[PDB]
Amino acid sequence: GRLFVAVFDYETPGIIGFKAGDRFLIEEYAENGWCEAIHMDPVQKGLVPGNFLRPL
C-alpha cells in the first residue's frame, strides 16, 4: 500500500510508538482511530493512530 509519515510523536503508546518524521507503509489507511502500518526509523508492524500521520 501507500507511504505515510508521522506529523506528531506517539512515543509511550499490538499498538506501536513512533516520532514525527517516522515513515509507514500502510495498506488500509483510516484517518480516524488506528490502522495497520509497517513502521521504519529493525522494522515493526502494529497499529498506529491514522490522524497522527500524513501521506508522503
Side-chain angles (χ1 to χ4, degrees):
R2 298 128 66 162
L3 278 143
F4 287 80
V5 59
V7 298
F8 312 120
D9 298 351
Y10 189 71
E11 344 208 47
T12 76
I15 297 178
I16 61 178
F18 56 85
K19 298 159 66 268
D22 285 356
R23 268 83 68 122
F24 304 87
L25 182 64
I26 298 188
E27 201 169 347
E28 279 177 31
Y29 177 69
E31 25 192 56
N32 308 293
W34 279 257
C35 44
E36 200 145 66
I38 297 79
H39 172 226
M40 305 158 246
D41 305 54
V43 135
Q44 57 167 13
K45 168 187 156 101
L47 292 189
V48 295
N51 70 318
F52 281 54
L53 265 51
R54 298 292 186 277
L56 201 56

